[PDB]
Design an enzyme around this catalytic site. Structure first.
Site, PDB file in Angstrom:
ATOM      1  N   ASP A  69     -58.300 -57.314 -80.036  1.00 45.00           N
ATOM      2  CA  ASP A  69     -59.229 -57.724 -81.081  1.00 45.00           C
ATOM      3  C   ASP A  69     -60.606 -57.905 -80.448  1.00 45.00           C
ATOM      4  O   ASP A  69     -60.725 -57.984 -79.223  1.00 45.00           O
ATOM      5  CB  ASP A  69     -58.771 -59.012 -81.794  1.00 45.00           C
TER       6      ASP A  69
ATOM      7  N   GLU B 181     -50.458 -51.469 -89.351  1.00 46.21           N
ATOM      8  CA  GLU B 181     -50.539 -50.561 -88.212  1.00 46.21           C
ATOM      9  C   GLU B 181     -50.940 -51.473 -87.044  1.00 46.21           C
ATOM     10  O   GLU B 181     -51.631 -52.479 -87.232  1.00 46.21           O
ATOM     11  CB  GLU B 181     -51.605 -49.476 -88.432  1.00 46.21           C
TER      12      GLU B 181
ATOM     13  N   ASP C 149     -63.023 -63.516 -95.166  1.00 43.91           N
ATOM     14  CA  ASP C 149     -62.805 -64.267 -93.944  1.00 43.91           C
ATOM     15  C   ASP C 149     -62.952 -63.445 -92.669  1.00 43.91           C
ATOM     16  O   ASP C 149     -62.145 -63.566 -91.745  1.00 43.91           O
ATOM     17  CB  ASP C 149     -61.429 -64.944 -93.989  1.00 43.91           C
TER      18      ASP C 149
ATOM     19  N   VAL D 188     -47.143 -66.644 -88.627  1.00 40.45           N
ATOM     20  CA  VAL D 188     -46.996 -66.057 -87.304  1.00 40.45           C
ATOM     21  C   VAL D 188     -47.024 -64.536 -87.391  1.00 40.45           C
ATOM     22  O   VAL D 188     -46.563 -63.954 -88.370  1.00 40.45           O
ATOM     23  CB  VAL D 188     -45.677 -66.498 -86.633  1.00 40.45           C
TER      24      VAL D 188
ATOM     25  N   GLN E 126     -61.684 -62.164 -84.442  1.00 40.22           N
ATOM     26  CA  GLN E 126     -60.247 -62.014 -84.290  1.00 40.22           C
ATOM     27  C   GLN E 126     -59.609 -61.079 -85.314  1.00 40.22           C
ATOM     28  O   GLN E 126     -58.498 -60.604 -85.080  1.00 40.22           O
ATOM     29  CB  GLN E 126     -59.561 -63.392 -84.319  1.00 40.22           C
ATOM     30  N   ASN E 127     -60.303 -60.819 -86.432  1.00 42.43           N
ATOM     31  CA  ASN E 127     -59.805 -59.924 -87.476  1.00 42.43           C
ATOM     32  C   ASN E 127     -60.349 -58.503 -87.322  1.00 42.43           C
ATOM     33  O   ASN E 127     -60.144 -57.665 -88.203  1.00 42.43           O
ATOM     34  CB  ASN E 127     -60.206 -60.417 -88.876  1.00 42.43           C
TER      35      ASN E 127
ATOM     36  N   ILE F 285     -47.475 -62.107 -81.236  1.00 42.54           N
ATOM     37  CA  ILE F 285     -48.889 -61.868 -80.989  1.00 42.54           C
ATOM     38  C   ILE F 285     -49.602 -63.210 -81.011  1.00 42.54           C
ATOM     39  O   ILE F 285     -50.118 -63.664 -79.989  1.00 42.54           O
ATOM     40  CB  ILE F 285     -49.510 -60.949 -82.064  1.00 42.54           C
TER      41      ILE F 285
HETATM   42  N1  LIG Z   1     -52.590 -55.195 -86.609  1.00 44.96           N
HETATM   43  C1  LIG Z   1     -52.514 -55.774 -85.365  1.00 44.96           C
HETATM   44  O1  LIG Z   1     -52.232 -55.081 -84.407  1.00 44.96           O
HETATM   45  C2  LIG Z   1     -52.773 -57.125 -85.212  1.00 44.96           C
HETATM   46  C3  LIG Z   1     -52.482 -58.017 -86.296  1.00 44.96           C
HETATM   47  C4  LIG Z   1     -52.733 -59.419 -86.192  1.00 44.96           C
HETATM   48  N2  LIG Z   1     -52.467 -60.201 -87.179  1.00 44.96           N
HETATM   49  O2  LIG Z   1     -52.935 -61.430 -87.205  1.00 44.96           O
HETATM   50  O3  LIG Z   1     -51.727 -59.786 -88.198  1.00 44.96           O
HETATM   51  C5  LIG Z   1     -53.285 -59.938 -84.976  1.00 44.96           C
HETATM   52  C6  LIG Z   1     -53.581 -59.065 -83.887  1.00 44.96           C
HETATM   53  C7  LIG Z   1     -53.329 -57.647 -83.990  1.00 44.96           C
HETATM   54  N3  LIG Z   1     -53.590 -56.826 -83.008  1.00 44.96           N
HETATM   55  C8  LIG Z   1     -54.506 -57.119 -81.883  1.00 44.96           C
HETATM   56  C9  LIG Z   1     -53.721 -57.641 -80.705  1.00 44.96           C
HETATM   57  C10 LIG Z   1     -54.148 -58.802 -80.023  1.00 44.96           C
HETATM   58  C11 LIG Z   1     -53.413 -59.299 -78.919  1.00 44.96           C
HETATM   59  C12 LIG Z   1     -52.257 -58.598 -78.539  1.00 44.96           C
HETATM   60 CL1  LIG Z   1     -51.363 -59.194 -77.202  1.00 44.96          CL
HETATM   61  N4  LIG Z   1     -51.807 -57.463 -79.180  1.00 44.96           N
HETATM   62  C13 LIG Z   1     -52.546 -57.003 -80.250  1.00 44.96           C
END
Ligand SMILES: NC(=O)c1cc([N+](=O)[O-])ccc1NCc1ccc(Cl)nc1
EC number: 2.7.11.22
Length: 294
Positions: free
Chosen positions: A82, A77, A123, A17, A127-128, A10
């Site tokens: 984002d 999950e 934080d 990572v 993006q979160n 991701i």
């Molecule tokens: N819980 C998650 O699903 C998730 C976790 C983290 N992370 O930092 O643990 C970062 C992005 C995430 N999803 C959004 C996402 C963004 C881009 C792509 Cl290609 N696919 C999914």
């Protein structure tokens, strides 16, 4: 992976990572984060493990904390996008007000829940904040900051974003309160509205001064105790506060009123998530479906 199958990388989180992975047995698709070092503090594993019991529809579920081979992995999950990417994709036309309101309302419900359970994020940033096709938005990484420690760098010399940091943190306060999250969310609310970051600082002092240039240099009147903060300097320039109407145009007075309460300098005057949910701004809140292209 003793039980997974990396679907792809991701990105590069603040801790390590992150991979999209599929559980070979269950077949479930999850987000796997490998945490950054030389033994993994037992204090951290216990705190993180408690977060597994923190479930709410607007909080990204922490499925598992894996401490094996002396390494630390967090299984979350998975959500497909984002808010940072969504905002960029909606840059030309802007996120519709009804959807901005729905997202803000949901994020505040998420914060109210975490805060009532004594869990802070510390934080928050676009993006979160993860979204799905159903119109839901969820907060990711709650409580990791406390369980672990100060950010500074991701794991591979990456620049920490200071854009959403509350002024009390920038002024060196050692004790964070739930208010820091409300500040970050106010900054994000403003960004969804104007389609530009509210305070895009490129250094801690530039961040602080961008805040001062907009909201006015704080003083003992509006923020009792500010001149005694660890990093406060009497030499800070004194800027006058800007009219709120110029900060997030063309947001209506209900929106500006709520934003002003989320951005009060004094953390003790800053509105709580529970109180924000009752603000008149949410009188007509609904739950629209976003146009998501995955
Ligand atoms: N819980 C998650 O699903 C998730 C976790 C983290 N992370 O930092 O643990 C970062 C992005 C995430 N999803 C959004 C996402 C963004 C881009 C792509 Cl290609 N696919 C999914």
């Amino acid at each position: 992976m003793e039980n997974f199958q990396k679907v792809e990388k991701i990105g590069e989180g603040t801790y390590g990572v992150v991979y999209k992975a599929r559980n070979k047995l269950t077949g479930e698709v999850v987000a796997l984060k490998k945490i950054r070092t030389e033994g993994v503090p037992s204090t951290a594993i216990r705190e993180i493990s408690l977060l597994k019991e923190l479930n709410h529809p607007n909080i990204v579920k922490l499925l598992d904390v894996i401490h094996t081979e002396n390494k630390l992995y967090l299984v979350f999950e998975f959500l497909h996008q984002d808010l940072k990417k969504f905002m960029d994709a909606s840059a030309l036309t802007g996120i519709p007000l009804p959807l901005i309101k729905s997202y803000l309302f949901q994020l505040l419900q998420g914060l109210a829940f975490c805060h009532s359970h004594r869990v802070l994020h510390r934080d928050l940033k676009p993006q979160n904040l993860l979204i799905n096709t159903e119109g839901a938005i969820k907060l990711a990484d709650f409580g990791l900051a406390r369980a672990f420690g100060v950010p500074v760098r991701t794991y591979t010399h990456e620049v920490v974003t200071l854009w959403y940091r509350a002024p009390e943190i920038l002024l060196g306060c050692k004790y964070y309160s739930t208010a820091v999250d409300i500040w970050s969310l106010g900054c994000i609310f403003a960004e969804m509205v104007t389609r530009r970051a509210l305070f895009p600082g490129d250094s801690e002092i530039d961040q602080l001064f961008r805040i001062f240039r907009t909201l006015g240099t704080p003083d003992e009147v509006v923020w009792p105790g500010v001149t005694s903060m660890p990093d406060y300097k009497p030499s800070f320039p004194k800027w006058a506060r800007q009219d709120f109407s110029k900060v997030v145009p063309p947001l209506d007075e209900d929106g500006r009123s709520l934003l002003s309460q989320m951005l009060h300098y004094d953390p003790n005057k800053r509105i709580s998530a529970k109180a924000a949910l009752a603000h008149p701004f949410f009188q007509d809140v609904t739950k629209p479906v976003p146009h998501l292209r995955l």
